């Protein structure tokens, strides 16, 4: 009934939910579909703008900044408001266009110098770790006072996009600890997404929470310990995923359907129809 019709507010909510669920490397195609389906660019711009930003922060989208060598991750931790984000490695702020995925207008950004040495020490250890362990990985390390507590937040991204082969994948990990000697709780989340869509639509989605402990001493030593914890946990996770793959393949998949009947030949279809 008309009283219970789907409202334009509900339609742009649906549009925004669809964009936020775009696979890695496929934002543009999902956006274009949703745009043509809504058929109302003004409703889309006002009602789904936050979803552009939500997707990029959720995906740890890497972005090149003109003039600066390494890329920075778009995360919730770098959101400075007014469509600007923080690059804490270069200590700059920059405008980010969430649709074109383009950075502009870099300006120096003030840095609370209480975490400068610790953020720099963790960043340098983590950068070496990421280049060693990932094919084209990127990472961003933040330093903030959260609830009066000095915290280090490390974010890692690694994707492989091959749309011409109809697949895309992305790895994201996020690691946190407070600078609280002698022992700090480590909290982490690891995420994998893979999309394959040649004559089909197959997706892997995985998510693991991690709790560990790190010994806090000097900035350089803690950084070393922190990276050791990351390496061990990310190595173990990758192992466990491939072990889950093996069990799915030789236990669950095989139990779902035989390769052939016990006759070890295909079916005699006239014996099937016989009385």
């Amino acid at each position: 009934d008309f009283e219970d019709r789907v409202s334009d507010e509900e339609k742009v909510r649906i549009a925004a939910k669809f964009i936020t669920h775009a696979p890695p490397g496929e934002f543009n195609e999902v956006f274009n579909d949703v745009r043509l389906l809504l058929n109302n660019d003004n409703l889309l711009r006002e009602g789904a703008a936050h979803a552009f930003a939500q997707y990029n922060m959720d995906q740890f989208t890497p972005v090149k900044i003109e003039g600066y060598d390494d890329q920075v991750l778009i995360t919730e931790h770098g959101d400075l408001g007014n469509g600007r984000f923080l690059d804490p490695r270069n200590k700059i702020s920059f405008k980010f266009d969430h649709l074109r995925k383009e950075a502009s207008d870099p300006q120096p950004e003030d840095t609370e110098s209480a975490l400068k040495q610790w953020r720099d020490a963790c960043d340098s250890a983590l950068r070496a770790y990421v280049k060693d362990h990932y094919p084209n990985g990127f990472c961003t390390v933040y330093g903030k006072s959260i609830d009066g507590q000095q915290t280090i937040i490390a974010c890692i991204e690694s994707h492989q996009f091959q749309p011409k082969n109809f697949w895309n994948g992305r790895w994201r990990s996020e690691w946190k600890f407070t600078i609280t000697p002698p022992t700090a709780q480590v909290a982490a989340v690891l995420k994998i997404q893979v999309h394959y869509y040649e004559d089909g639509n197959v997706q892997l989605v995985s998510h693991k929470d991690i709790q560990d402990s790190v010994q806090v001493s000097s900035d350089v030593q803690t950084a070393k310990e922190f990276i050791k914890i990351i390496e061990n946990a990310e190595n173990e996770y990758q192992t466990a995923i491939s072990e889950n793959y093996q069990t799915m393949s030789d236990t669950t998949f095989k139990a779902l359907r035989r390769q052939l009947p016990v006759t070890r030949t295909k079916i005699d279809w006239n014996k099937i129809l016989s009385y």
Binding site: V6, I14, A15, F18, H21, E26, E29, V30, D33, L36, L37, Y134, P135, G137, S158, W167, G169, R170, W171, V194, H195, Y196, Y197, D199, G200, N201, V202, Q203, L204, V205, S206, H207, K208, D209, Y237, Q238, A240, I241, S242, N244, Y245, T247, M248, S249, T251, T252, F253, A255, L256, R257, R258, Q259, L260, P261, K266, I267, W269, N270, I272, L273
Partner: protein
């Protein structure tokens, strides 16, 4: 215009884990596409009980009329319907035979699960859907499910000694568990062929052979894509 195109493309990208919810929200977004979307977007199969014969049967758009679905065993709709889409008398006889053949097929290859076959008349032939659903037993802390949807079209010829078969087949394969891990979705393949129609090679044997060939092929491609390619992609991320 391009809306139906965009909607189908969009369903090839949204997580298959939420197919049912995303399709309903998609139709709300563009209601004029409801009929084409319900007949074009494959959805996980649902099980219903035919209380008259005491047998399970499978639900999909092809046995739906309004909010009612038709049982292949009793040929009645549930909830009851007085004006429901029905196969012609002659095609229904063939539908009964097809259900019994593919129930045996199901037992031979899946050793359990549920099957259903629904046929409908066409101007110069007929069409059918062959459905199989088999849930994993949950062993080793892994939940699985297999959904087969085979849609066949039969174009009959003047000689009655040859017909043209067109097969569109989808298998939906769903797996989920350290932490959480969910590997799911589907693959679709097509093929078309002429076959001899004879007293010794009737329609159901021709269809049966095409479905078996296709599903054996898709089982092997699922093995390759799910446990080969997507694992390889994961390992190439790190």
């Amino acid at each position: 215009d391009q809306q139906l195109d965009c909607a189908l493309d969009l369903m090839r990208r949204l997580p298959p884990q939420q197919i049912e919810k995303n399709l309903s929200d998609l139709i709300d977004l563009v209601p004029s596409l409801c009929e084409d979307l319900l007949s074009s977007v494959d959805q996980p199969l649902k099980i219903a009980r035919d209380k008259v014969v005491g047998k399970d049967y499978l639900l999909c758009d092809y046995n739906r009329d309004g909010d009612s679905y038709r049982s292949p065993w009793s040929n009645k709709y549930d909830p009851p319907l007085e004006d429901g889409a029905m196969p012609s008398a002659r095609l229904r006889k063939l539908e009964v035979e097809a259900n019994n053949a593919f129930d045996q097929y199901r037992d031979l290859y899946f050793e359990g699960g549920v099957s259903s076959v629904y046929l409908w008349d066409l101007d110069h032939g007929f069409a059918g859907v062959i459905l199989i659903k088999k849930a994993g037993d949950g062993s080793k802390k892994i939940k699985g499910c297999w959904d087969s949807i085979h849609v066949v079209e039969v174009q009959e010829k003047s000689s009655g000694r040859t017909a043209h078969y067109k097969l569109t087949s989808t298998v939906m394969l769903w797996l989920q568990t350290s932490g959480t891990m969910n590997l799911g979705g589907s693959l679709t393949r097509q093929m078309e062929k002429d076959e001899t129609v004879s007293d010794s090679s009737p329609h159901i044997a021709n269809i049966g052979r095409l479905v078996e060939d296709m599903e054996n092929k898709i089982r092997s491609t699922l093995n390759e894509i799910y446990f080969g390619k997507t694992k390889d992609i994961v390992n190439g991320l790190r």
